[PDB]
Write a protein that binds this DNA or RNA. Structure first.
Length: 1326
RNA sequence: UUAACGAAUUUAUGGAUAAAGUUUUAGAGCUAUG
DNA sequence: CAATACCTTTTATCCATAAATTCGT
DNA sequence: TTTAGGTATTG
RNA sequence: GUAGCAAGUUAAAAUAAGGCUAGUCCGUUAUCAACUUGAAAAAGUGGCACCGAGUCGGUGCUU
């Protein structure tokens, strides 16, 4: 006897309940707790507010670094382990001294100076190597033996910061002068070619080769410079090669098959010799010269500076940076003293300022310092040399900045290698471990491996050959690299939907292809002259045809079948095929790709070979890595000629299928003994399809299927599997929790109807007219100009696409009065530009029930075509405009019109329907078919949206939160209504498979716009009492039912519930905070008194706990009993739950009443005093609790007062809409007054209200549309939720926050249910 | 996901890396003047 | 106290898998 | 991308 | 301590406290009114009708 209407979003589930006659019911509810309120009445309408669900993404990102850091201290640790034994000879406590570098000297356990214990030698060190980058250049350049500590600092510093792995390959210090490298390339081609020598001449190889242009555009510029040679010529292919293009030398040598070579792709080292053996090995020397150039190009942008003197360009790059800063510092530092020496203290001494002193000592960014002194630079002479340095964005640069991520790790290795190479003569262990160290900088755990777990990671999948611990150096021997990469993909691969216990087969699987082929073929039927009736393909023909036609050719067309098989093999001269369209959809692409490679047709047909052929595709489809496939296939090498093997590694397959191996060939009917496949060929004269095979009660397949699936899943797994936003899933979980408690409410009775709905260019307008009057060539853009911000008004913008002439009358339109002109939809109500037109009168188009008439088209069938070529209209706009000459909107064209509009297309929402639909109908009748006890409906969001506008139930968001339920109410009404009149739409609108026929055009309705029947009076007659045509059920009364809808909207009591949530996540605000003598400073790691070292701050409060114990006071230390709110932080909560009391005593409580302790989750609910409500937003803060039920007349007024998007509706209706403003103009004083009684009652912020009251007084004479909108802001003051700031038109009003929580402790605590209806209240007394 | 195959973008889940930030210490502040 | 003002790590790169979405053949 | 809770200090 | 001036660009170390399963692992997502039951997963618990409407008020029958 009831129906539920849901309105789902990101932050709300809205829910209302409807009657046979569309009221919203009520009921008295029993109330628990020690309070005198023992029962209360509530309406059966509401919404459920919650904070949005959070993606795992941010979390997983924290995970990455968590991993990066525990692996970086690991890498530096490895270098120490190499050094430890040998460093100890030089310095006993060097490593210790660095470990404890961060400790204050009071806490230091060794000398304060790290590199060397003595004060004196540290001073010199920084004297001679101010930056590490200084030291690095020295360690690379000098031939002298350098101190081991110094050596260690260089290596570890490159190892701590490697730069990126975004190159695969290698790069050298020799490869910096591209010309020097270029000429060597030219030189080799010349020591090899005496008929066509080339000359280097005066080609600016350096400038041409390395520039921001395409890898292609640079290429053309090289060969342009030279004496004229073909980009296709050999030298161009080599120049091309370096540039990273794929160049094919086939045309040059006219080789039999094409062999291109790319230097980024893997196949380069292998391809070169495959080409090289035919060409001869002499030629090989050239290509390496060409690769070398590539490497010179590659780093040519990363270190643009000259690096000719040294083997350490990066550090050379830094050292030049450091000196320019020193140079430019003094030039600035002096020039400020020279002419403007008053500000110097502000710039260079005050840290807070964003001066240089701020730049270095303060936290100002390079960006902030540059901006701050650009004024000063251009107020003093000699600035310009300095300023061209600032506009360059290269001034007083730090060595280490955001920029450096650009550097490729390789360039660091070259400095480390060169450092190691230098000093290995002096220290033996370095020569031995040089290789072992280099792997540290070079090593990177490959992604397909995943984290190297020992079964203790959710995420990890890798596999190991030996259970021993993994170093960068033994990785290959312990880690099963390949079988890891299979596991890697296999976990993200789909399962088989029909039996989701077995993995999907590769889509290109040979078993898969056959199944996909035979299922299309079983349903093929042939009709011939001899036969009385059409007959299925029989068991032999499928088996013949496939051997005959599918093995011969990749794709099989129908004419191929009748001429190649039917006429040739059965000698039927004519036949007719019902079963398939113009060609067979399936194909055996692998058979042929496999047939052509192994070149053995016998090998493909022996069924004993199928187990071996599946594995080749599965390994072939799986693996990315050239090497890796081979380690797998080697088991098979014997079956095959070595040349056969070579082609197989090449073919790689992309994509995973739909179905399991087991389903197709493993499952077997206990009765028939035959598998799925074996029923797909040879089913006898009645030949069944795959769906039919699973859906045959007599066969074991439907029963065998059902067993795997139940073994189903709980709600979260059912809900979480859903595809879409992780947040809108939350509303779903809550939306279903909401229905289920609604069910509890109706005496455990189920509802008949359920209606669910979920909610979801400024310059684009300027460019589509710019180019559409450019190809029209018209001067209507020149005649009157407009701006880019203006065209969000339709009637202005539609004039411009039209060019000033009406598509219905062919005359020029006045610019000033578009008010008199109508916007016309090409098709009777679509609001897009595609279907909107502007003419003086919309009756010119013909009948208003008719498509734009033949009468107007004939004058302007040409104007609309002029507009299409100028992209001033679209194919959808035009094909609807001319549509009168295609018989107009056909009954079947009009069926496309409304049917497309109404049905929900979104795959998430659909799934929700199942979720509800399956959760309702548990009962099954004696037949297998389901009982549709409850009907689920999915409504588009627009349908209600226009109805509110059409039928005076206007929506304003920010006044209130009641509108959330109000859409749920309105969604239940429009829903139950559209299905009450038309069951023919039950199959379209409801998850229920019945079936609906398009043919009608059960006569129902002539007109194309669906939402008409509610209307008492409609724009060109309906009886006010509506009934279904076929059964006589009375469905809509235009007079009777409407009163209650406006009344229910108008209802002042709705259930608004904001879901209560223990706070999860990060412990505290992330920033490190400087040492302080505060007690709220959280220590970073144990031995660091934040007072000494700095610490954290601002912990997040997981939940509040109410305490009722005693405490010590004064030097007296007297015990007196306190009751208050304790803030359990996220860090604390783990510790708190183990022992509440011991933990409580440690925070200072004595004699806690253990039993009365209440954990108050966030958004917790209290009503105190006069029934104003407070939500606990923290242990120490509170949040607004009451929504102000603005009377319906004001909402409706304010929406029209707000004058949303000028006026969209019909213009005669608009004069009453404007009239309503003046008639209800005195309301503005009434609206403001509503707030005042409510603020004074609930908000208790009078401080603020006063600047408000003293502000509406001031702008009384300002217009209403402007005044009303600014009035709307205020409600955020009155709004449930957080104090946040709002502004009246000229004044910003700050928020009134509740920094004391005492008022709760003596109030009545409210626990409410998910609906809000069932409660337990608790009045608080110590 | 389509009446069927492909391509793309998006979002979701997952992996491997990078560069900045922040914090305490080390980078002997000197010269007049109590 | 309760106002008051102030605070709140970010920005890249590569690889995979999947739905869902809108194009194509 | 802006929220809305910490946090310390004032008249 | 106030005046004067020199100075500055780098480094090391930590990067959620930390946990045991000590792995070159894990540590911010989802999930949560209350009461009884449960290790948890979860299951259980709240008469109806009418008249009305400033955030639910009254009344009749059963209870």
């Amino acid at each position: 006897k009831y129906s539920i209407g849901l309105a789902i979003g990101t932050n709300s589930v809205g829910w209302a309940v409807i009657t046979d006659e569309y009221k919203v019911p009520s009921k008295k509810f029993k109330v628990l707790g020690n309070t005198d309120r023992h029962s209360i009445k509530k309406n059966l309408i509401g919404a459920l507010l919650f904070d949005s669900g959070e993606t795992a993404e941010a979390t997983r990102l924290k995970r990455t670094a968590r991993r990066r850091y525990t692996r970086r201290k690991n890498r530096i640790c490895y270098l120490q382990e190499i050094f430890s034994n040998e460093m100890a000879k030089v310095d006993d406590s060097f490593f210790h001294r660095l470990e404890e570098s961060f400790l204050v000297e009071e806490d230091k356990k060794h000398e304060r100076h790290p590199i060397f214990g003595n004060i004196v030698d540290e001073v010199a060190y920084h004297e001679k190597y101010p930056t590490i980058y200084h030291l690095r250049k020295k360690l690379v350049d000098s031939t002298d033996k350098a101190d081991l500590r110094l050596i260690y600092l260089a290596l570890a510093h490159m190892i701590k910061f490697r730069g990126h792995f975004l190159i695969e390959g290698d790069l050298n210090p020799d490869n910096s002068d591209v010309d020097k490298l270029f000429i060597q390339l030219v030189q080799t081609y010349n020591q090899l070619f005496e008929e066509n020598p080339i000359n280097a001449s005066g080609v600016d190889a350096k400038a041409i080769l390395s520039a921001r242009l395409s890898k292609s555009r640079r290429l053309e510029n090289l060969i342009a410079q030279l004496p004229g040679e073909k980009k296709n010529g050999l030298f161009g292919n080599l120049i091309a090669l370096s540039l990273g293009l794929t160049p094919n030398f086939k045309s040059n040598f006219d080789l039999a098959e094409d062999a291109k070579l790319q230097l980024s792709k893997d196949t380069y080292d292998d391809d070169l010799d495959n080409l090289l053996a035919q060409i001869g090995d002499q030629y090989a020397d050239l290509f390496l010269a060409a690769k070398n150039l590539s490497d010179a190009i590659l780093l040519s942008d990363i270190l643009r500076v000259n690096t000719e003197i040294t083997k350490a360009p990066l550090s050379a790059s830094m050292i030049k940076r450091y000196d320019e800063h020193h140079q430019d510092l003094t030039l600035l530092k002096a020039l400020v003293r020279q002419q403007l020496p008053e500000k110097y203290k502000e710039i260079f001494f005050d840290q807070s300022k964003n001066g240089y002193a701020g730049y270095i000592d303060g936290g100002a960014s390079q960006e902030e310092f540059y901006k701050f002194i650009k004024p000063i630079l251009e107020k003093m002479d000699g600035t310009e040399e300095l300023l061209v340095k600032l506009n360059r964005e290269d001034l007083l640069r730090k060595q280490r900045t955001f920029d450096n991520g650009s550097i490729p790790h390789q360039i660091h290795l070259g400095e480390l290698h060169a450092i190691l190479r230098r000093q290995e003569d002096f220290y033996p262990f370095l020569k031995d471990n040089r290789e072992k160290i280099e792997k540290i900088l070079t090593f990177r755990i490959p992604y397909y491996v995943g984290p190297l777990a020992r079964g203790n990671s959710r995420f990890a999948w890798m596999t190991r050959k030996s259970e021993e611990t993994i170093t960068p150096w033994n990785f290959e021997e312990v880690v099963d690299k390949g079988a890891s990469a299979q596991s890697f993909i296999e976990r993200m691969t789909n399962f088989d939907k029909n039996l989701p216990n077995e993995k999907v087969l590769p889509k290109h699987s040979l078993l898969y292809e056959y199944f996909t082929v035979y299922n299309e073929l079983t349903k093929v039927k042939y009709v011939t002259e001899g036969m009385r009736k059409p007959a299925f393909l029989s068991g032999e023909q499928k088996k013949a045809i496939v051997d005959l036609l599918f093995k011969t050719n990749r794709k099989v067309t129908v004419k191929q079948l009748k001429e190649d098989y039917f006429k040739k093999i059965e000698c039927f001269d004519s036949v007719e095929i019902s079963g398939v369209e113009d060609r067979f959809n399936a194909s055996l692409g692998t058979y042929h790709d496999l047939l052509k490679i192994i070149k053995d047709k016998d090998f493909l047909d022996n069924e004993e070979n199928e187990d071996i052929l599946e594995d080749i595709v599965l390994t072939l489809t799986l693996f990315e890595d050239r090497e890796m496939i081979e380690e797998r296939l080697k088991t098979y090498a014997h079956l095959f000629d070595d040349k056969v093997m070579k082609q197989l590694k090449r073919r790689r397959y992309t994509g995973w299928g739909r179905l399991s191996r087991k389903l197709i060939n493993g499952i077997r009917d206990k009765q028939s003994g035959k598998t799925i496949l074996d029923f797909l060929k040879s089913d006898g004269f009645a030949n069944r399809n795959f769906m039919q095979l699973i859906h045959d009660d007599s066969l074991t397949f439907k029963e065998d299927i059902q067993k795997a699936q139940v073994s189903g899943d709980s709600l979260h797994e059912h809900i979480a599997n859903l595809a879409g936003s992780p947040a809108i899933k939350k509303g779903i979980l809550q939306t279903v929790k909401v229905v289920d408690e609604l069910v509890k409410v109706m005496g455990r009775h189920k509802p008949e109807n359920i209606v669910i709905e979920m909610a979801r260019n400024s310059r684009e307008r300027m460019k589509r007219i710019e180019e559409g009057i450019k190809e029209l060539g018209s001067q209507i853009l020149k005649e009157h100009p407009v701006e880019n911000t203006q065209l969000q008004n339709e009637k202005l913008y539609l004039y411009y696409l039209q060019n000033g002439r009406d598509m219905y009358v062919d005359q020029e339109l006045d610019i000033n009065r578009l008010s008199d002109y109508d916007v016309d939809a090409i098709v009777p109500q679509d609001d897009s530009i595609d279907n909107k037109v502007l003419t003086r009168s919309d009756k010119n188009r013909g009948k208003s029930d008719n498509v734009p008439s033949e009468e107007v088209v004939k004058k302007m069938k040409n104007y609309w075509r002029q507009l299409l070529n100028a992209k001033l209209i679209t194919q959808r706009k035009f094909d609807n405009l001319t549509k009168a000459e295609r018989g107009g909107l056909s009954e079947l064209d009009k069926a496309g019109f409304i049917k497309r509009q109404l049905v929900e297309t979104r795959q998430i929402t659909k799934h929700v329907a199942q979720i509800l639909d399956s959760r309702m109908n548990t009962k099954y009748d004696e037949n297998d078919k389901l009982i549709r006890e409850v009907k689920v409906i999915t409504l588009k969001s627009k349908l209600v949206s226009d109805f509110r506008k059409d039928f005076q139930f206007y929506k304003v968001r920010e006044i209130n939160n009641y509108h959330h339920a109000h859409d749920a109410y309105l969604n239940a009404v429009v829903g139950t209504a559209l299905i009450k009149k038309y069951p023919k739409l039950e199959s379209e609108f409801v998850y229920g498979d019945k079936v609906y026929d398009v043919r009608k055009m059960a006569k129902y309705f002539f007109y194309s716009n669906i939402m008409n029947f509610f209307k008492t009076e409609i724009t060109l007659k309906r009886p006010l009492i509506e009934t279904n045509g076929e059964t006589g059920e009375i469905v809509w009364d235009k007079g009777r039912d409407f009163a209650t809808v406006r009344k229910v909207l108008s209802m002042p009591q709705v259930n608004i519930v904001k879901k209560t949530e223990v706070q999860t996540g990060g412990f505290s605000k992330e920033s490190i905070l400087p040492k302080r003598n505060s007690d709220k400073l959280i220590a970073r790691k144990k031995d660091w008194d934040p007072k000494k070292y700095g610490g954290f701050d601002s912990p997040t409060v997981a939940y509040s706990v109410l305490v009722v114990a005693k405490v010590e006071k004064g030097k007296s230390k007297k015990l007196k009993s306190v009751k208050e709110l304790l803030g359990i932080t996220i860090m604390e909560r783990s510790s708190f739950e183990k022992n509440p009391i011991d933990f409580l005593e440690a925070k200072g409580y004595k004699e806690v009443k253990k039993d009365l302790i209440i954990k108050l989750p966030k958004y917790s609910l209290f009503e105190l005093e006069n029934g104003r409500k407070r939500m606990l937003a923290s242990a120490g803060e509170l949040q607004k609790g009451n929504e102000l039920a603005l009377p319906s007349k004001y909402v409706n007024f304010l929406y029209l007062a707000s004058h949303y998007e000028k006026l969209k509706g019909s213009p005669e209706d608009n004069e009453q809409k404007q009239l309503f403003v003046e008639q209800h103009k005195h309301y503005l004083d009434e609206i403001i007054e509503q707030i005042s009684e409510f603020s004074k009652r609930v908000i208790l912020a009078d401080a603020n209200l006063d600047k408000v009251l003293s502000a509406y007084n001031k702008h009384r004479d300002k217009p209403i549309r402007e005044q009303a909108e600014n009035i709307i802001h205020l409600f955020t003051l009155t709004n449930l939720g957080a104090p946040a700031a709002f502004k009246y038109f000229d004044t910003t009003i700050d928020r009134k926050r509740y920094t004391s929580t005492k008022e709760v402790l003596d109030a009545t605590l409210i626990h409410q249910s998910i609906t809000g209806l069932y409660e337990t209240r608790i009045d608080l007394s110590q």
